[PDB]
Design a protein around this ligand. Structure first.
Ligand SMILES: Cc1cc2nc3c(=O)[nH]c(=O)nc-3n(C[C@H](O)[C@H](O)[C@H](O)COP(=O)(O)OP(=O)(O)OC[C@H]3O[C@@H](n4cnc5c(N)ncnc54)[C@H](O)[C@@H]3O)c2cc1C
Ligand SMILES: Cc1cc2nc3c(=O)[nH]c(=O)nc-3n(C[C@H](O)[C@H](O)[C@H](O)COP(=O)(O)OP(=O)(O)OC[C@H]3O[C@@H](n4cnc5c(N)ncnc54)[C@H](O)[C@@H]3O)c2cc1C
Ligand SMILES: COc1cc(OC)c2c(c(C)cc(=O)n2C)c1OC
Ligand SMILES: COc1cc(OC)c2c(c(C)cc(=O)n2C)c1OC
Ligand SMILES: COc1cc(OC)c2c(c(C)cc(=O)n2C)c1OC
Ligand SMILES: [Zn+2]
Ligand SMILES: [Zn+2]
Lengths: 229, 230
């Protein structure tokens, strides 16, 4: 059996993102997988990295250093419960899918705040244990991104550059760094200008791809993959 | 000179190395006689989430909420939440916007990502058409002043992290150039926590020193080739 966590960042259940999340739940549930969804906006998930993320008393209450404080908090079981709740889902998961609209070539700030606050030192990475040896190694991660821009805008010589170029900080700098093997991203280009069909083809392709997600090999998550020819 | 600067600052700790870079900027720019404003996001408890609370008028489509459509509308009607319009005023007046922050996950801290997502709305920062070189903030300068955990050597093409310019792309091109800014070369202060106390003073005064001649700089060519090479 396998466990999947979907971390989902869209305000509107009727959205194209909402339908992609909902077919993932339906298809992975149909296969017998254990599925959990973190619907960040419904949870009013806190995005800011602050001293509230530590309960009881700080390791150095003269000069606040978020990284050191959350590292010590993790080790002393002193993190806020919204964070540890997410860490439990991630620890149990075999695959983590992030489902979100591209905001400013990146994730919406609420999902950025999940990455900043959930993936702390001791949990997701340490000295050592990063990139290849990151603490989440053995787990799979997958970005399912929707865009306002069309596929042609996202080419090396198009106005937006190649899609892979905006993937680097998320796939390499975040998911690889924590040890994830990164599945190929699912990019649903410009759903809002596509037809009622086309949109169906995109959703159905996603549902279709999920049918054989466990047979996939991860991308080689390298500078060459993102930037080379 | 007769110029206005906005510093958008994202760090929790006033005694931090970011706190020092922000204050040296304020001291040097104020010394030159520039007009200076700082948006200290954590101290303001700045709201990062893009939600329907950012619009206070009748929604264009209250059956199916589309944040970009509703905020674009709300900007035209003046029904945006006032935290957002308070920032727009600072940006509209500024000739240079400096972002001061620690690198978090190859990007800005979520509180600052939220400032970008909610403040740079359609109608204000760009339109369709009216983006990249035609973006609505054309004529303004922006500059990322980023600190890292990683050393410079780490952030080279054959270092573990890849070249520093790679992680600049979403921010410089995808956000600031998109809105029309000309982008000045980034100030990257590498690995201050590892550096010696004297190498730290050196990085602070190197930023101070650069600001002395900031108005004479040309912007970078904010292209794929600048960021990625051939
Ligand atoms: C702050 C901000 C920053 C942005 N930055 C970027 C950026 O850097 N680059 C970029 O390219 N874009 C950017 N965008 C645009 C954004 O990425 C797109 O708006 C978003 O990806 C569209 O996805 P959605 O789910 O919201 O679309 P929706 O509008 O919800 O989807 C399109 C249509 O499909 C309908 N639908 C729902 N379910 C289904 C289904 N079952 N089958 C068929 N249709 C269905 C919807 O109701 C809708 O009519 C930005 C947007 C914002 C607000
Ligand atoms: C969630 C998260 C994600 C991160 N992701 C990344 C990443 O992707 N890539 C990466 O490289 N790093 C990353 N980091 C590390 C982060 O970028 C660095 O910790 C940050 O850049 C260091 O800057 P700071 O101001 O907090 O340093 P500080 O810890 O405040 O400063 C270091 C030292 O400089 C001293 N100092 C303060 N003022 C002065 C002064 N006037 N003169 C001389 N010294 C002074 C301080 O007192 C301190 O001792 C991440 C950190 C976190 C918390
Ligand atoms: C650039 O130096 C580095 C590089 C790292 O990873 C590449 C680090 C750390 C620290 C302190 C903790 C940690 O978990 N990692 C993962 C570091 O600081 C010494
Ligand atoms: C801020 O909103 C943005 C930002 C963008 O880029 C950073 C966008 C778009 C759309 C619709 C198409 C597109 O290609 N890009 C590149 C967008 O929607 C208006
Ligand atoms: C999540 O925290 C992170 C994440 C990183 O990369 C994504 C880091 C580092 C540090 C300290 C050095 C570094 O080179 N990288 C590359 C870090 O600090 C522990
Ligand atoms: Zn990688
Ligand atoms: Zn550019």
């Amino acid at each position: 059996g396998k466990k999947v966590l979907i971390v989902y960042a869209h305000q509107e259940p009727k959205s194209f993102n909402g339908s992609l999340k909902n077919v993932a739940v339906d298809e992975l549930s149909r296969q017998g997988c254990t599925v959990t969804v973190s619907d960040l906006y419904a949870m009013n998930f806190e995005p800011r990295a602050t001293d509230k993320d530590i309960t009881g008393t700080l390791s150095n209450p003269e000069v606040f250093n978020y990284g050191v404080e959350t590292h010590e908090a993790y080790k002393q079981r002193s993190l806020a419960s919204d964070i540890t709740d997410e860490q439990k889902k991630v620890r149990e998961a075999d695959l983590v899918i992030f489902q979100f609209p591209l905001y400013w070539f990146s994730v919406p700030a609420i999902l950025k705040g999940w990455m900043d606050r959930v993936l702390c030192q001791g949990f997701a990475f340490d000295i050592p244990g990063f990139y290849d040896s990151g603490l989440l190694q053995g787990k799979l991660a997958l970005l399912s991104v929707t865009t306002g821009g069309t596929a042609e805008m996202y080419t090396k010589t198009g106005v937006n550059g190649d899609s892979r170029y905006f993937l680097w900080p998320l796939q390499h700098g975040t998911l690889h760094f924590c040890g994830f093997k990164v599945l190929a991203p699912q990019i649903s280009f410009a759903p809002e200008i596509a037809s009622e069909e086309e949109r169906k083809g995109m959703v159905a392709a996603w549902s279709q791809r999920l049918q054989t997600i466990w047979k996939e090999e991860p991308i080689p998550c390298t500078a060459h993959w993102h930037f080379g020819q």
